Amino acid sequence: SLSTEATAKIVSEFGRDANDTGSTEVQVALLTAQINHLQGHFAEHKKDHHSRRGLLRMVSQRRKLLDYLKRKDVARYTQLIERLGLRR
Amino acid sequence: FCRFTAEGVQEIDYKDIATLKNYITESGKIVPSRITGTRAKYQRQLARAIKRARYLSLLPYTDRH
Amino acid sequence: IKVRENEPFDVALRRFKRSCEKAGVLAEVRRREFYEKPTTERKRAKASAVKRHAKKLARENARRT
Amino acid sequence: MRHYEIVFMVHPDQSEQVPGMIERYTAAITGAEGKIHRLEDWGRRQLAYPINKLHKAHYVLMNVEAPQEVIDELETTFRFNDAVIRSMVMRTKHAVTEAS
Amino acid sequence: FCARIFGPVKDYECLCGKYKRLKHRGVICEKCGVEVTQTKVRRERMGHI
Amino acid sequence: MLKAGVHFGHQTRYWNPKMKPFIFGARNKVHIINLEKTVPMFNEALAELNKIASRKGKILFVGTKRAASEAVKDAALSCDQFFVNHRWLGGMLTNWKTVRQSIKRLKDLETQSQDGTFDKLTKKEALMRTRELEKLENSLGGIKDMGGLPDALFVIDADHEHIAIKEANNLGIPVFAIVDTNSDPDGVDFVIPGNDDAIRAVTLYLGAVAATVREGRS
Amino acid sequence: SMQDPIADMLTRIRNGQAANKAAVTMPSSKLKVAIANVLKEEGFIEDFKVEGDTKPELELTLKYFQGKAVVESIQRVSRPGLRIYKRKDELPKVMAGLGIAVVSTSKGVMTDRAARQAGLGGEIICYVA
RNA sequence: GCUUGAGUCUCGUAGAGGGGGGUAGAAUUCCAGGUGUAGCGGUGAAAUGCGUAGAGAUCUGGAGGAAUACCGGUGGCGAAGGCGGCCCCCUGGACGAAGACUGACGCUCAGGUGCGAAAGCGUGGGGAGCAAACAGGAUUAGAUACCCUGGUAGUCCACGCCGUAAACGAUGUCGACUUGGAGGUUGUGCCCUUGAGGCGUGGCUUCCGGAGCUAACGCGUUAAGUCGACCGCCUGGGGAGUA
Secondary structure (H helix, E strand, O other), rough: OOOHHHHHHHHHOOOOOOOOOOOHHHHHHHHHHHHHHOOOOOOOOOOOOOOHHHHHHHHHHHHHHHHHHHHHHHHHHHHHHOOOOOOO | OOOOOOOOOOOOOOOOOOOOOOOEOOOOOOOOOOOOOHHHHHHHHHHHHOOOOOOOOOOOOOOOO | OOOOOOOOOOOOOOOOHHHOHHHHHHEEEEEOOOOOOOHHHHHHHHHHHHHHHHHHHHOOOOOOO | EEEEOOOOOOOOOOOOHHHHHHHHHHHHHHHHOEEOOOOEEEEEOOOOEEEHHHHHHHEEEEEEEEEEHHHHHHHHHHHHHOOOOEEOOOOOOOOOOOOO | OEEEEOOEOOOOOOOOOOOHHHHHHOOOOOOOOOOOOOOHHOOOOOOOO | OOOOOOOOEEEEEOOOOOOOOHHOOOOOOEEEOOOHHHHHHHOOOOHHHHHHHHEEEEEEEEOOOOOHHHHHHHHHHHHOEEEEEOOOOOOOOOHHHHOOOHHHHHHHHHHEEEHHOOOOOOOHHHHHHHHHHHHOOOHOOOOOOOOOOOHHHHHHHHOHHHHHHHHHHOOOOEEEOOOOOOOOOOOOOOOOOOOOOOEEEEEEHHHHHHHHHHOOOO | OOOOOOOHHHHHHHHOOOOOOOOEEEEOOOOHHHHHHHHHHHHOOEEEEEEOOOOOOEEEOOOOOOOOEOOEEEEEOOOOOOOOEEOOOOOOOHHOOEEEEEEEEEOEOOOOOHEEEEHHOOOEEEEEE
């Protein structure tokens, strides 16, 4: 669900400001943190087929801004996945 | 036209039944939204009040058995 | 559900019965459910109910005879 | 932390040995970090419809701000108490103090 | 205290409250020929026996 | 004073303003109509209404409205002009090549009630000859004496006499029609919006047009 | 996403007539300015303004004459999916001489007649009549 | 490199959206106990059957399996299909006031993957109401059809397979553009929200119509209208959407 208490901290760490959240290393880690906490949802009960398209949504979009950071700064791309760890 | 769910701000709880005995028929039924003119949304919100009143025995399911 | 009235009747008088619900339970419990009817009749029914009001506004324009 | 409007009815039998439990339950909220909004004891108000055995139960209201993991243990205790026959809670964010 | 014999109960207001707007300031009901008018004019409105 | 007190009309919101443009519909409770575009648009109105009046255009006055129907007889009979103040007969200006024969009907029955068959027949039938006269006369009287077709057309309502406008367009006749923000403004010579359903509207409208007739016949 | 900017322009021009307005806005660019400045040079559109600091708001002023639209039949040639490269000889003359074709030449956007004056062509933008 | 495209974040909103489990009230069948009748069911009519080995009905109590009333709203969610009591755990999609940014990061798509009501089958539970196969009385020239008395697969839940439909406002998806109103449903900004109002801004959906299209009925801001992008399909019916 990506708690607000954690979102403002990720933007606090990765982002260089409290509110400069429209940048690459923010929207990716944010959506990655959604998955990282979403474990508890797609682990137990399992049969959430409608919630599957919700996953579809956020995971693919994440791979879209990474899809752009790759064409721009490969130094920060390998650095982003290196700090948090969102490739694997 | 009532000062219940339009001017009566913030969800009407079922605790004060001195008003809910006006919404149920003296048996246990509910009065239609076309009778006691209230917006369908809050008639469902009052439906939440009457429902929990039926779960805590303040407004029964029916009069007698 | 239950009507009393001590002794100024000299008649069965099923007034409050028919005023509460009475038949409203029989109409749904006598025959099979038929998973389809609700959809059907909730829609068809109220659509036609709206037409009467629409009739009210469209019948007073001309009619000059 | 979380708002739960705990309304419960015990037996008119426990109508006298429950105020002592009033001390129990809210003291446990004190021992679980939580503030109570409205401690009330109206009396043994007549129920709507008879609940299996007797009519007229003893209503007592709390409406307390406590963790959900605490009211979870609490409703368990209510449900596993020979006094309380019915006890339900509401959802967070909103709170009352009137209840009349 | 008649509408047709003397005049409008209130200003341009019908007793049945049917007619309201100023544009219908002279319309005569097929049944009650009562022209909605200023109640002041209901000082000049004489009747007869 | 602001024309009939206030000619920008009135029109209640169900005034469905496609017309929105033509009026910049200012409102007053019920709503209203066309402030500006109506006040100024009437001086140039009496301008065109003046020129095609001098060149003999025969200005018909059309008003099927039961109330201002006599204001139609006013501005038309008091001068010499023609009119149409009653039920619009389907074809009195598009099938007129047959209603001219209806004039033969109307004009000769006038003659028959005079010195023709006025009492040369059973009384029982006499009654009917006269009766029918009244009905076809109250709507055809203002075209019976024409020597061709009209050019100037002062149509009051459009909300009810739209076909009166449409059948005139069967020949292309210029239409000076006072209309509404939910009427039929398309296909006119000059839509002069504002109120078109008020007794005093037709009072100073036709008064301000009756004066224009008293000039164009010179 | 509104895949063609000139489509977003000519549609607002065609239906700008289907709305019969007197002023229509749309995203401006060095290209649209060019086309509209030539549409002005002829007598299709009336005075266009580039009002906008860093955000060029192309504001047109539709032009009529007798009481009819001068820009009556109009649409695009160089579709984004089908780009029609034309020379000078096989050039399209709309209406046998009653309508023109805006063309982006080797010198820039101008009438096809002025492209003949140059003697070079390629991207025939759109037909305007 | 810059933004009117897409999208994210901050603060919020309503619900038959879904999955796993539990709970509440009451009821049909059946069982037992108190009472009691000679009839009950049903049909256009009749009847097999049940019954005096006391049925149907009435009162109280109880074990199974399954279904959610008034509130209900061509209303809501969704790709589609489909889906109504409530609560608990978890989560998504749709949308909006006022701003900060990456700066076209966007759309669709054969082979392919995934979803796929209902039903059939393999397996472990299962059986109240109903019901393929079948038996019986008849309307009838006959009944393996309409009716009725029983009853098995099934109906329900979980794991897989066939990967099928009227899976149809029959109208593919995305963006832009083109006079409105009565409505329904869900938010918000502004003004004396003093009150259930007024003026704008988005999604979904119905009806009456304009420009336009069509064989016509009619669709009509959710278009069968005007363009661009992407995909599947047709060339008279039958044969056959079959081997």
